[PDB]
Amino acid sequence: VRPNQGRNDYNQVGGKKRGQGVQVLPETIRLLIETRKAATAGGPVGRQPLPKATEATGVSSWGRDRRFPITEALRLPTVAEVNAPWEGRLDKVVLHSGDISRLRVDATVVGAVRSFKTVGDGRGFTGCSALLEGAGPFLSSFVSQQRRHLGEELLHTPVRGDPSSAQTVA
Amino acid sequence: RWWTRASGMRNPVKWTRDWEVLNRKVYFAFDEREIRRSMLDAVNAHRKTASLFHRMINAVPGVAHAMSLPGPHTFFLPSDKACRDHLSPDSLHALTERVAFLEEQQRQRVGGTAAAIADRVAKTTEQLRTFVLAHLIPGEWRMKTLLLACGAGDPRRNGSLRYQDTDRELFAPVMYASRLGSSVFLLPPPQSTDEPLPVWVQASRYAAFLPITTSTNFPRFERRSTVGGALHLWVGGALVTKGDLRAHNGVVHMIDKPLIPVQLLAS
Amino acid sequence: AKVGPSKGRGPLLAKFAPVGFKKGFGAIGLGRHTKKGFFIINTMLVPMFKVPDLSNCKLKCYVAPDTYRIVQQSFNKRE
Amino acid sequence: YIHEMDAATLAVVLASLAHSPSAYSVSERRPPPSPSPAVSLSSSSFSPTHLPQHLDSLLALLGRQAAATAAHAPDSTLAFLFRGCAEAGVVEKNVVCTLLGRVEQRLPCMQLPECLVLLDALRPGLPEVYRHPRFVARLVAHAGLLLQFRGAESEAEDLCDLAFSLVFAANCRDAALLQTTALLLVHGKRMQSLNET
Amino acid sequence: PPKTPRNVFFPWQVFSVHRTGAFLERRRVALKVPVNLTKFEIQSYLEKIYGARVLKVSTLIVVPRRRRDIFGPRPSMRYYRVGCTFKKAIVTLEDGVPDAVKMLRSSIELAKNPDITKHNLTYSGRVRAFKPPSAAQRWEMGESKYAWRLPIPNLLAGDEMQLNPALRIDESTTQMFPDFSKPFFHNAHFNFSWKPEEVPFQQTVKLDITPWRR
Amino acid sequence: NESSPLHMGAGSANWTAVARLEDFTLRGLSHPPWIHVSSRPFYGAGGGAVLAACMSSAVW
Amino acid sequence: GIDELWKGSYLDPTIGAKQKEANAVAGDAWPACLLRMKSFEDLHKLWYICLKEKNLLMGERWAARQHKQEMKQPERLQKVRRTMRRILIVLTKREIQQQCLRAKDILAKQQKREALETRRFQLEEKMLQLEHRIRRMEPAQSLQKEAWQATLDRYRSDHEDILIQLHPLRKETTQLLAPDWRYERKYSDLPGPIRWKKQYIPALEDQYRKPIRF
Amino acid sequence: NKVRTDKKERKRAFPQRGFWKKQNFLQVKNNTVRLAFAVQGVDLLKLKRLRWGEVRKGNTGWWTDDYRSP
Amino acid sequence: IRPRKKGMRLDRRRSKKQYKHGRHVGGWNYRWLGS
Amino acid sequence: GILRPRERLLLNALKKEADIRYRGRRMHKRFRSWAQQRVRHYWLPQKVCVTSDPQLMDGSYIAACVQKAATLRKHDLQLWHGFSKRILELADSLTPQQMGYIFYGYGKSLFRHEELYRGLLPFVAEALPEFHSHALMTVAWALERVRVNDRAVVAQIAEEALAKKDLMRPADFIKIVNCVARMGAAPPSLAAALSAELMRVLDEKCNALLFRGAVDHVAVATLYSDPLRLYLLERFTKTAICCRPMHYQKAFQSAVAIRVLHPPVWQQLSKAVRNFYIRLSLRRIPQRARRPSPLHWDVSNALAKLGVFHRNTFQWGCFWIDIGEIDDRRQCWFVDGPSDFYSSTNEYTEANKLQHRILSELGWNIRRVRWNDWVQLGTDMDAKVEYLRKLRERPPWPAILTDGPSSSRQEMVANLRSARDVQRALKERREKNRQPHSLVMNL
RNA sequence: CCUUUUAAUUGAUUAUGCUGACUUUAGUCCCGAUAAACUACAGUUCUGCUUAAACUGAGGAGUCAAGUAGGUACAAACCGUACAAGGAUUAAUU
RNA sequence: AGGGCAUGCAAUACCAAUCAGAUAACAACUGAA
RNA sequence: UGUAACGGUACAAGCUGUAAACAAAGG
RNA sequence: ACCGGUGGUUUGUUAGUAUUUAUGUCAUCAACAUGUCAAUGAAAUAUCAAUAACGAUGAAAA
RNA sequence: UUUUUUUUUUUUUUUUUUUUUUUUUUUUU
RNA sequence: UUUUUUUUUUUUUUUUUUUUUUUUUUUUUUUUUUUUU
RNA sequence: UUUUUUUUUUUUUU
Structure with a gap:
């Protein structure tokens, strides 16, 4: 039997090693979740006459309720301002850390496939799936119709060192 | 992480080297070996192989109690294949129908038609019990025991079983260029039968090729079953593919033919 | 003492001990132990040796003695 | 240590970041003797310390981890994970696909308590990726079998939640299902629980 | 020593040749390496830096023996050692290597000639040598005892090599063929483990354990 | 009196001695004593740039 | 070779x-x-x-x-x-140059961060006081309530701007705080290494894990 | 022991008449070495016996000089 | 020390006993560096 | 405690038996090793679900799925066909990397479906410039395994390989060469260029381990020039140690074929080199277990009924013979099949033609029996016997093997389907005759 | 030198006293069971004991000690020796 | 102090009821330092 | 902080830490 | 008058001084082994010449 | 052929030792 | 009769576990869904 | 006393 006897820790019932494949009951999970949920129960405060900016320029936004916030592009600091001390060039360049999709901009550059098909995702880069999900189903139809209508136009590129050709293409 | 950890090949323990004493342990480890499992256990283990038998045993009462006794016994377990290929379609279908009927009766219990059901079950149970019990034989009869009994070990009777040869020029021309260009043993009667059981031995096809790949010292002279082994045991003209299924109650042998009593045999 | 580091024996080693003592000399792992005594080796943990091309190299291990005087002479010009 | 989290931990973690998180919930190092703002934890008109937009980096990782952890999650935790991802706002189609698949796999093995939490993921305002017709059709079909063969086990509160889910979340139009749910709430042997719910 | 990182740009390992007093095969070279390197790492070092062809790499641990300061006019009785702990590596190169590099030579002690004596000696306290079965000796990938007479090999062996084993039997260490009828040994010419059919029938003798019963 | 390196190492080794209710103040050749040994001396006329003095307090 | x-x-x-x-x-x-x-x-x-x-x-x-x-x-x-x-x-030395430069930049940014933080701190306390004052008088209407609402409205923007301005700095500042495999002696051997101290994570420490690496 | 640490110096104190000579084993060992050199074709005994400044090419000795009068 | 005896004893470094003396090569009065 | 004397004996004997038994198990275990290696530098990091909706899948997703299925050996028709259907739809949005993965998966799975290969080939042909080593290797490797020759595309593959030689891997280069040689699509000029590049590749960026893979009897005698032949032969000798039976066999075959076909080159070798090969033949080379095919057995039964003695299976030095007559050993038959010919065609393979010519040279009366001709006979024995008899009276085949008439996928399918039922009806009839059915129970 | 002082512990044949050297007993006692031959024309000395086979398709049937004890010039020195894949397909070269 | 500085002395204590270990779900469960 | 092991140095009661007895020249 | 640098006195000419290791024991434990880092000489940057003798340097030697 | 690793079976830690250096955006080629 | 072994793992049986999973090494063979048996 | 693709998990047994 060895001299291991007498110790209170001898043949202890239940242990770290013993229990390796046991999961907590859903009761605990539910309890925790509910507890966390029920921490900010209260009435509204402040004022909200006008709706929150959640849409592009021109288009109004009163009915389309959005749970997620949207960041403004025109409000971000520039690299020069960032690097300035306390008291082209980098005066019009911004390096943002966030969701591209959730950004109000005039234009967005996207990397599409050669066939120009929106199936699941594009090239897989960061934000492509976000962008394509945000975009409505009619994107596919528009691109499809455009393909057909254009045709030949989609099979040429400007000549290197040809600014006039680039402008004509544009 | 102790004094010694060597195992396997490198066994620290010391064993006896004497062949005389070593020759006694083999007998104890092979003949006087003890088994915990019963006959039923062995039978069940091969339920897949003998489903018919496995089901009949547990279906018809009496057989289960009979096959659990402490006294030594010998059992034969015919194969499903054997049954299928031996039995006629009508007999096979009729047997299966009655087995299913008994199983359905038990399922109904656990879950003049009333009078007729009693007579039908009474007759079918007796018929199947008679059929089943026929295989059972009192006493423990081993494969070696039978083989020796059949005169397999007698030099005066091993003449037709030891010297075997075949045309080597036809099967190994490259290695031979110069050539180019038993008795019946009677067993005790079964439990549900009075007639004895004859047993004999025969030479296998494989036995006639040993000299081509083995050192032989013969003196100067002056269908085929695919089962392995040099010798084939025929118990009542049923070939044994497997045997020596030792148990706490006896032995079990698998035969390639279902033994049917005369009482069940047609005219 | 008869047994131990007291007669120039030094620290215990695999060699100087019964079978079963586990002690290496410093290495890098290249796999893991299974539940049956086997060992699955992985090629991912092997280091990579980087060496530039040496087919055409003008440089040598040592410097010519005449270099010293030439380097020295340049200093005097700055005066 | 996002990548070291389990399903259980990750579900609650996700929920935390989705259920109107507050910055004052964090601990303090040698705070003043007076109480902390955490005592009240009421609906504020502003975001303390940081804005909600400063967590997408972490969100991405969370989702990725969820994706991985999906395969070793019991049935009970699986649905909680599923709902938590949608609540959080996991937009990643590649991430969602696998989740959907596993959910589909494990669907028949679930029951009404695990189906209501599933249905919660199809509420309005959530991403449309989770609203796959092939998924919702199987879910609403499975709910019918549960109500048909295990209707005596469902409680009044569960039936009330299911009625709201089948009308506002799933946007179903099955008059037979709606009538069965209505009948099983007023005609069944549930007066004692209905009066106390 | 310090562990080797994943990307090595300035390796510090120093490789050198070790002159051993034992006999070495043609395609085998003995090197001295640290005690912190692996087979793979050793292989790669030579493969990338030197670019030498390598087949096999064997490793051994070398530990110096203990010594005592007993000699001299003023001994200290203190313990010490000569040399350092290292890894004796053995590399099986593709090409041959001269013996004058790997093996030692000395004229003062004529007995010290591992290159000349080859494996005939043990160079240690090994009274009995050990030699496992050879590749050719083994069944798998082993030379056949009956393949010499085949048609196919002879085709290849056209006026270039004789496959008949009867043309390569030593005459100074072989006995004449005895008569089967007459008693003779088995090992004289029978280079196998089976009784030839030519041999007449042999009788068997069984020991009597209880002769008194007669 | 038998020779047992296992016993020796399991009862009289570096990790086994520390568990002993002994006078550790005594110097030990093959033991981990707790006696202080005063370190490297003062500096004479060598280069001031190459005089070592600390390590665990300075590691970075 | x-x-x-x-x-x-x-x-x-x-x-x-x-x-x-x-x-x-x-x-x-x-x-x-x-x-x-x-x-x-x-x-x-x-x-x-x-x-x-x-x-x-x-x-x-x-x-x-x-x-x-x-x-x-x-x-x-x-x-x-x-x-x-x-x-x-x-x-x-070549490496140390860059290290110095980096250090300099981080110290440059710290100073603006400080002030920004301070300002935000103050504004949050004022906004909390205004929200409590508004909440205390819910079932009643007056001019004072309107005044407080206006002031809170003002402070909301006044605070949001601060966070918008602050975002970039926090990320940059917290550069070296987290480990980098690239800079580790394990994954690299280049001059200018970086070392980190192991933390204590109960969530991990309370779990049973084998010493495996794959 | 090479280290000279055991109690093997106790017996040596007392005088002795003689000691064993493993001639049988030594002879065998020498023979094996001789054979191992002979197969290559170099004489070891000859070199271990020849006079300091003596030159003897091949299997030659005193006997050789007998008939070689001229 | 035996297994049974060793299983009920703590390490000496677990206590403050190691910083309550001044034994050194110089003598019995040791002063720590930078004191 | 203490034990009974009776029990003691039994326990000790049992224990002893255990030892004996354990000693008796590791006999044949020679080549085993506790240590092993597993390839892990190919799996993707991203997680996928094979059992997912194919519609929601993309190129990336599908690519991953295909390879994971292959690795897990989840052979499911219902699963694979959906993959193929979705791949056909998404054929126009596949990256070179993805395509390669797809190909590798298909090939590893041995999923015989020409419909997909034929549809994916043209897109590969257009994206050849953007292709890489791995993709290029996988394409050919899959194609070879599935036995779908494409001389139009395979050649292009080779040319792109040659263009990107400076960026390619030795292994992939070697495999490409091998594949090309087996498919038979390299004109003389291409062959020459391939050989010239291969020699430099082997001599500059190849080791013992990598060199062994360059050994191929079919390739050696049809692609490789004399200068590369000699170098290969010479380096094999030196690199023989680090080899396997699979390479040994190939080497031996190479030697034999060289001797038989190119006496000059053979003689050009050195004495030492020659000796190696000479001695090689004398050794016993392990071989995998082999047994007759159902077609083989049917042919053998017809032959035996005709009244001719022969053998089932046997080895002859370095070549296997389907049928060998005992009365006249010179005679031999060969039973072909669908695999013996390219997909949708009846053209013989390079290995089959090389083995036919080597034996014809060596003097073997060789006859061939096709399967499409045989199937037509149905389950009639007299027709097969007459068929065989008519063949026997005719002269043997020429040295140079020729191809059969044209065929089609439709025809192939039809034939296969037809044969499916024949192989089952014959088995049923065979099996039924074994049943005596004598016993009759009264009951 | 003389004179004053000195808490030097200041005084020896001996406690079978402690630490060392060197005489007498005292060229006394102590020496283990079995050897011999190597020549002036060929050869096999006697005795005690009796597991001395090293591929035959099979890792010689094990453990432990030696903190490396059958390597090396009639060396108690220096210098070497532990390969589980057996590297010499070294059946060739000269 | 320009640069570099393997390994061992069992270390979440620059903090916090006690009682094994990488410092223990309640209870069982106890105490002169 | 104080110490033990291994490696280098001339194998050592010293020095030293694989960068193992030195950078002294940033336009 | 803090704080940095330099110098001197006392402790102390009257007092004392320890760091490395061969050997004993299972362990606790005990213990002052063996002149000096050292030919000698103030100086070896004085030890020359070699064949016996006589010769050289040094206060002194072969 | 052993040792290593699961079980027996034990932080009943064999100082300078290990599948054990911070715990997977790994650039799949 | 003095009343004697079983857990890691192997085989068999029963299944909705999982890249923590078998060479992108190689051979052989008539062959496999839905609108060819 | 576990033997050749790695883990989790249930019954019987020569």
């Missing part, structure tokens, strides 16, 4: 004594003066050349040691060691 280990050395059996003596000659070690003018690639190649020379030298060293004799021209080793040290000195 493998031949390089002994080719041109004293160990070479295919050359005479005069050739070995002529080969034995050497010059001066590469100084920091010259080593500073070279680029990364030249120093990287010179490192391997010096390593090859050290490997060749060691053999002779050991050979001599064997016979209890001094190696011919022992200064070569010293020379090679000095060159090898000087190359790494150069490289390390």
